[PDB]
Design a protein around this ligand. Structure first.
Ligand SMILES: *[C@@H]1O[C@H](CO)[C@@H](O[C@@H]2O[C@H](CO)[C@@H](O)[C@H](O)[C@H]2NC(C)=O)[C@H](O)[C@H]1NC(C)=O
Ligand SMILES: *[C@@H]1O[C@H](CO)[C@@H](O)[C@H](O)[C@H]1NC(C)=O
Ligand SMILES: *[C@@H]1O[C@H](CO)[C@@H](O)[C@H](O)[C@H]1NC(C)=O
Ligand SMILES: *[C@@H]1O[C@H](CO)[C@@H](O)[C@H](O)[C@H]1NC(C)=O
Lengths: 42, 86
């Protein structure tokens, strides 16, 4: 239940259809900042 | 030119006046075979950090070994076995 008095936290709360814990805003943050084995450069 | 590493058949545009390449650290990267003229890269040998996880020596002297950032293929009792985790 999201009866938060009208406040909408859906953009900061976890998104179940996201990388398993990350909200929309965390996804935006993680997309605005930029094991190599031995056979990946061989 | 002496060195240690793996030689791999590659494809680099070597003009017919060059002999070997150079990495950004001024280290050889690819060489053209003096006889079977082929520009083959020189990659350093398979290296990997090795950390030793251990409980207190007093408690026991059994340890685990973490090979850092290597797939569980390249890697004596702690080299293989049925107790390997990726
Ligand atoms: C909280 O806000 C989100 C978006 O900020 C709302 O989700 C939108 O809902 C409308 C339906 O009215 C859809 O057309 C949008 O595509 C939705 N957007 C997203 C990003 O899901 C959500 O409905 C709001 N919650 C409440 C209770 O109003
Ligand atoms: C000698 O080297 C040349 C490269 O200039 C090559 O074409 C030739 O096959 C080589 N011969 C022998 C016997 O190795
Ligand atoms: C070994 O020493 C550690 C402290 O470094 C201690 O916490 C631990 O209980 C000791 N184990 C035994 C079996 O005495
Ligand atoms: C290790 O190599 C195997 C080769 O089959 C591959 O499937 C696996 O994804 C590799 N491990 C990693 C962490 O890339």
């Amino acid at each position: 239940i999201k009866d938060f008095g009208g406040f909408n936290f859906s953009q900061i709360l976890p998104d179940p259809s996201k990388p398993s814990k990350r909200s929309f805003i965390e996804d935006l943050l993680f997309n605005k900042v930029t094991i190599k084995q031995y056979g990946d450069c061989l | 030119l002496t060195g240690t590493g793996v030689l791999t058949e590659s494809n680099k545009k070597f003009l017919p006046f060059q002999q070997f390449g150079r990495d950004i650290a001024d280290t050889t990267d690819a060489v053209r075979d003096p006889q079977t003229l082929e520009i083959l890269d020189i990659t350093p040998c398979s290296f990997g950090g090795v950390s030793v996880i251990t409980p207190g020596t007093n408690t026991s002297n059994q340890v685990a070994v973490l090979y850092q950032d290597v797939n569980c293929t390249e890697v004596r009792v702690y080299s293989t076995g049925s107790n390997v985790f990726q």
